[PDB]
């Protein structure tokens, strides 16, 4: 079954993309999803490519794509906690903290996490030095 070689190439991918091989992570990541559209594990993991490859746009994209099929397959709100955290950070990156304490909030609706936490403040606290 598609769904068993799925986590596979996640683990394919994540391999790559522990050897700075983003481009072939993302490629067995996005295998993955073809393999199992309805995992957002597989999903959150791609835009943490993105992240890596410069584009947060695209991780901000695939992240939040992954909490709609996640919060509809009954997955993980956990995992959906720590791709909201992916959101806010890749708008903690593109300097949009406006953007990333909002998603970042939403991580502690889910998953209430130290990390998350932290950069809810590192955010707002960044935003005011910034205006």
């Not at 522990?18 to 309805?38: G, M, Q, R, S």
């Not at 992240?63 to 099929?69: G, L, P, S, W």
């Not at 397959?73 to 995992?79: G, K, L, P, V």
């Not at 998603?103 to 910034?130: G, M, W």
């Amino acid at each position: 079954e598609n769904k068993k070689q799925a986590l596979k190439e996640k683990e394919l991918g994540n391999d790559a993309y522990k050897k700075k091989d983003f481009d072939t992570a993302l490629k067995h990541y996005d295998k993955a999803k073809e393999l199992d559209p309805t995992n957002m594990t597989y999903i959150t993991n791609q835009a943490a490519v993105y992240f890596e490859k410069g584009d947060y746009n695209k991780c901000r994209e695939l992240c939040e794509k992954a909490i709609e099929v996640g919060r509809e397959n009954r997955e993980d709100y956990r995992q959906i906690a720590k791709a909201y955290a992916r959101i806010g950070n890749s708008y903690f990156k593109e300097e949009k903290y406006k953007d990333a304490i909002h998603f970042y909030n939403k991580s502690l609706a889910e998953h209430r996490t130290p990390d998350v936490l932290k950069k809810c403040q590192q955010a707002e606290k960044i935003l005011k030095e910034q205006e």
